[PDB]
């Protein structure tokens, strides 16, 4: 929410860059494999510390989607704790700080009575934009692909070398959840202007 934007301003640029660098290294690591053992976010299988460097007052950034007027905190891992309050990052996929050979997967709950979250993620079209905001600032994506897969298929979630992507992942059809609707953005130039 607001505790992020503010809490961020209070941190020193050097500290920030130290922390971003640690994330880039993580990402470069993931990019390098071979394929990470990826695991259905929608199950208990046991706090998470992989993304400590990005963590600022519990979150690691914010996901903005103008088309559906959503601005949702992001939390590391996909524990139900976090899916109750916002989007959860899927451990094994790139940290959502961007860079070539990264593919971050962000996942969210549809239909919750508390928050809407990715409830209206079906209204998102190719062409649309969303933004990840993190300790580093705000980066921009343009939806380049929307795809419906079976729950045990994952090829679509891996890093694509030389490419910079973020996928918003939810369940589908609405209220049947036999499948997974993936909305994947592709990094585009964005000059944050006051």
Residue numbers in the entry: 6 to 39, 44 to 55, 60 to 207
Please give me the paper's original passages concerning this structure.
The two molecules of the dimer, related by a non-crystallographic 2-fold axis, in the asymmetric unit of both the type II and III crystals of the GBSSrtC1 display the typical sortase fold made of an eight-stranded beta-barrel. The barrel core is flanked by two long N-terminal helices (H1 and H2), positioned approximately at 75° to each other and away from the dimer interface, which is formed by β6 strands and β4/β5 loops. Subtle differences, such as one single-turn α-helix in the β1/β2 loop present only in chain B of both dimers, and a four-turn and two-turn H1 helix in the type III and II structures, respectively, may explain the plasticity in the sortase structural features, the presence of multimers in the asymmetric unit and the observed multiple crystal-packing arrangements. Residues 44–55 and 44–54 in type II (A and B chains, respectively) and 44–51 and 46–53 in type III (chain A and B, respectively), which cover the putative active site from one-end to the other, form the lid region in GBSSrtC1. Analogous to the Asp58, Pro59 and Trp60 residues of the conserved DP(W/F/Y) motif in SPNSrtC1, Asp49, Pro50 and Tyr51 of GBSSrtC1 anchored the lid in its active site. In addition, the preceding leucine residue (Leu47) was observed inserted into a highly hydrophobic pocket in the active site present below the lid. Cys184 in the GBSSrtC1 monomers displayed a single conformation with its sulfhydryl pointing toward Arg193, which adopted a similar conformation in all of the monomers due to salt-bridge interactions with Asp49 of the lid DP(W/F/Y) motif. Arg193 also formed a weak hydrogen bond with the backbone carbonyl of Asn190, except in the type II chain A structure. Based on its lowest overall B value within the hexamer, ordered catalytic residues and positive density for all residues, we selected molecule X2 of GBSSrtA for comparison with the type II chain A molecule of GBSSrtC1.
Anchoring of these surface proteins to the cell wall peptidoglycan requires transpeptidase enzymes called sortases, a product of an srt (surface protein sorting) gene. The membrane-associated sortase recognizes the LPXTG motif of the substrate protein, cleaves between the Thr and Gly, and forms an acyl-enzyme intermediate. According to the current model of sortase-mediated pilus assembly, the pilus polymerization catalyzed by a pilus-specific sortase is followed by cell wall anchoring of pilus polymers by the housekeeping sortase. To understand the molecular basis of pilin sorting and pilus anchoring within a bacterial strain, we investigated the housekeeping sortase, GBSSrtA, and a pilus-specific sortase, GBSSrtC1, from the PI-1 pathogenicity island of S. agalactiae SAG 2603 V/R. Either GBSSrtC1 or GBSSrtC2 of this GBS strain is capable of polymerizing GBS80, the pilus shaft of the GBS PI-1 pili.
